[PDB]
Structure 1
């Protein structure tokens, strides 16, 4: 199966390459392990901040829609055909893997609608939408990093399992094969010298007498 003479030279470079790959996988797993909690704290604060900021603007719009009567929120949702706060995808190299980022953009195509002025309730509807846009921009800006946190949380489990599998499976077969190959090479190197010494003793014994 394996060689019987000079086989440790491949196992030494394989063990050194496995150690270097385990060191690089440990460094990348450390960087992803730091970035995962580093994004997880800001996502943990931005979830409650976006929840309260969305709850206040939802309560104000619910109070304005309840005070208005004949709520046109279904008509305002059906009357909308374009958005104002958009997002742009971008790739950012952080720790070696490609993460998803979001860039907020302002749309100047639609600012006011046909439901923003009808009478006395239009000032309350525009007053609710004016705080709703400012809460929506901070809600999207706080909710932008969820794809990067979800990507790093998925990448760290593969990196730790790959580094643990390679580091757990690397050294012992090559070391245990190299030790038995060195011992077999030592015994095979010793037997030919023992036979040549055994023949050399009887060869020198004839010349020693004469």
Structure 2
């Protein structure tokens, strides 16, 4: 750049603008961290709920394979048409977009198979509740990952500015 008084004033203005931008980015990072902690807490809650659902579903299933024949529960599983179709709604995460998953449902017991014994039936409903908890856990984990990506990007931006420019 040409050495002149006007250029010196312009450079000083640019320095002031860079410092202000650094401060603004730091404030944004603080807000992102404040959101990230709540995401962490609710993700822990969802994980606990999913673990409880897993325990109850597996406990229900264990009786089906013992009291009912393995072929009986296998035929019950094969009789129901497979669950197909998961709705991925878009969700706004600080400019970025994340898929919000929610599953479709054929209403369950309306699709009852030839596997009539109750212990076989109970395992199915418990597994449906298990998947219901699983989709919630997936959603909260995706939101947490997006927030973490944004935090990383902001930190890299701050470091790049205040150590290069």
TM-score (norm 1): 0.65
CA displacement at 1:150 relative to structure 2: 1.0
Q: Distance in 1 between matches of 2:53 and 2:112?
A: 26
CA displacement at 1:164 relative to structure 2: 2.2
Partner of 2:65: 65
Q: Distance in 1 between matches of 2:86 and 2:15?
A: 51
Contact kept in structure 2, 1:85 and 1:106, CA below 8 Å: yes
Larger Rg: 1
The two structures, once aligned, show a CA RMSD in angstroms of: 2.8
Alignment of 1:77-156 (within 5 A): 79=79, 81-83=81-83, 86-92=86-92, 94=93, 96-108=94-106, 111-113=109-111, 115=113, 117-119=114-116, 121=117, 123-156=118-151
TM-score (norm 2): 0.79
Partner of 2:12: 12
**Structure 1, unpaired ranges of 5+:** 171-210
- Report the 3-state secondary structure (helix = DSSP H, G, I; strand = E; otherwise coil) of the residue aligned with 2:6: coil
How many residues align? The count is 165
Contact kept in structure 2, 1:29 and 1:159, CA below 8 Å: yes
Contact kept in structure 1, 2:108 and 2:125, CA below 8 Å: no
